[PDB]
């Protein structure tokens, strides 16, 4: 599934996100256009063999598995392919986890190079919350 940016903002708001650990809305919603472009499908390959999964790519090698991550952990006790439904609980609650590891929303390289310091409240600008 591909959400609508106001359609995200809303539902990562209903599942607790907006300000998570500080983090207001705008970040999950800039973090998730720049991971994913809004698709809950998205999957990106790294280069260490470990893939991304989901809305906010939510990588293998730490957070779920898919079976195919050698010297891995399942840190949110999920499947990756769970993190690919167009429902976005599980994307969710894994984050909330990534977040409060140590680094925040720096775990999301997109987040620290695209979203960081910059006017993230843009992306939730317009939306009924
Ligand atoms: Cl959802
Ligand atoms: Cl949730
Ligand atoms: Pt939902
Ligand atoms: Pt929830």
Redesign the pocket.
Known sequence: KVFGRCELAA?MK??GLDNYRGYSLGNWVCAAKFESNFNTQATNRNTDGSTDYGILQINSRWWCNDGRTPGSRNLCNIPCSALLSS???ASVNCAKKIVSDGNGMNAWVAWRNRCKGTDVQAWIRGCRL
């Open positions: 539902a209903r599942h429902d976005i609980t």
